[PDB]
Amino acid sequence: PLKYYDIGLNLTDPMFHGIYNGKQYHPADYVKLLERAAQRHVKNALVTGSSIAESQSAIELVSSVKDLSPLKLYHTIGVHPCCVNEFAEAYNESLYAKVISNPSFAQGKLKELYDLMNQQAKPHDTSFRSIGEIGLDYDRFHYSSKEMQKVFFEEQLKISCLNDKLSSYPLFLHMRSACDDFVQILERFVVGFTDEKDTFQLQKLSSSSGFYKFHPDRKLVVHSFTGSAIDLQKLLNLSPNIFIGVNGCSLRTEENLAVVKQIPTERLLLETDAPWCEIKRTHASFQYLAKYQEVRDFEYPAFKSVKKNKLADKLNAEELYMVKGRNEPCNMEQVAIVVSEVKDVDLATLIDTTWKTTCKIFG
Ligand SMILES: [Mg+2]
Numbered sequence: 132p133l134k135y136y137d138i139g140l141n142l143t144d145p146m147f148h149g150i151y152n153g154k155q156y157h158p159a160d161y162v163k164l165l166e167r168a169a170q171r172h173v174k175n176a177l178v179t180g181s182s183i184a185e186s187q188s189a190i191e192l193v194s195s196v197k198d199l200s201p202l203k204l205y206h207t208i209g210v211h212p213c214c215v216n217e218f219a220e221a222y223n224e225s226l227y228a229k230v231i232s233n234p235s236f237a238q239g240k241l242k243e244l245y246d247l248m249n250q251q252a253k254p255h256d257t258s259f260r261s262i263g264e265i266g267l268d269y270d271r272f273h274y275s276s277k278e279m280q281k282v283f284f285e286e287q288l289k290i291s292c293l294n295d296k297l298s299s300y301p302l303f304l305h306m307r308s309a310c311d312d313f314v315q316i317l318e319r320f321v322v323g324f325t326d327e328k329d330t331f332q333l334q335k336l337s338s339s340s341g342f343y344k345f346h347p348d349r350k351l352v353v354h355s356f357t358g359s360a361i362d363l364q365k366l367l368n369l370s371p372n373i374f375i376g377v378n379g380c381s382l383r384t385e386e387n388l389a390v391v392k393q394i395p396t397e398r399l400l401l402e403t404d405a406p407w408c409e410i411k412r413t414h415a416s417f418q419y420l421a422k423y424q425e426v427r428d429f430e431y432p433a434f435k436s437v438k439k440n441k442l443a444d445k446l447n448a449e450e451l452y453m454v455k456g457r458n459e460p461c462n463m464e465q466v467a468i469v470v471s472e473v474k475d476v477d478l479a480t481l482i483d484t485t486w487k488t489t490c491k492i493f494g
Contacts, residue, residue, distance in 0.1 A: 143189055175493070180208050213271055218237045260494050264303055265288070353373060398488075437453070
C-alpha cells in the first residue's frame, strides 16, 4: 500500500486556478487535481505560503476545501526571500538602509506575522504545520537585496523561537545559490546566540534573556534542493535534523542524480513543487520513467494531458484531465520511481521510509 506526502504543493499558484500568463483559460480545477492525486496514492500535502498575503491565501484555500479534498492538506506561514520587501534596482538597493534608519514599519510587519502564526497555531486541530518558506535566494536579487534577505530570514527565525509552541514547529527552508550564508545564519541558531540589541523589538511581543537556540528536536527541511555535492555535505553536517527535499528540479542532470544518491535515505523527503518541476524527456531522470513504462506497467502521463485552451470543455465529464506543462501532486510517484532507481533502493522500501519520515515531521 503506497502512500505519498507531497511537502511542496504550491496550491495557490494561478495555474491551479485556470490562469496562465495572466489570462484565464479554464475554471479553477484544484478539487479535480486533488482527486487525481488521491487516485495516485497521495495522502497528504503541505501547501506553501511565501508572503503574509500568500500565507493568508493558503489558510483560506485549505479551509475552503477541507470538506472537498480527498487529501489531508496542511500549510506553511512565512515570507520567502522573493517577498521580504513587504516588511519594508534603485528601490531594492535603497531599502535596507531605510529600514535600519527607521525600523518602525518593519517592527509592525514582524508583529503582524508573529500574531498570524500564533492565531493559526491556537486550535488543537490546526492545518498550520510549518514555518516557511523562509531563507535565501541569490538567483533573485532582482526581487530583493542580499541585505534585506539576510535580515528578514534571521528575524523570522527569531520569531519562530519566540514561544514554546512555535519553537516546536518544523522549518520549511528555501536555499538557492546561497549555501555558505544560509549555513552561517542557521549555525548561530543551532548552537545558540544572544540578541542584546533586538533592533526589531521582538522581545516586546518565552525569555527576557535574548537567547535564541533551536529546540534539539526541531526539524529543518531544506525544500527543493538543487545544489552541489559540497553544498549537500555542508547542509547535512549543520545538524542531524536537516532534511533534504527532492523534486523533479532536483533530478534534471546526471550531476543532480549523483548528488541525490548521497542524501541519506531517511533524511530525504519527496515533493513535486507543482505546478513547477515537471520531469521531462530532456532530463536525466526520464530514463527511469521510460524503464517503468516499458517493464513495470507505468502510465505516463498519469491521466490524459491537454493544452490549457482544451481543458474547460473536459470539466463537466467524469474523466480526469491534466494540463500540458502544468505539474501536479499526482506526479509524486514519478519522483519516487526516479529516486528509487538512482539510489538502488527498492521502490516500496523508499516510499515507506519517506512516508514515515514525512509524517513524523509535519503530522
Ligand atoms: Mg518551491
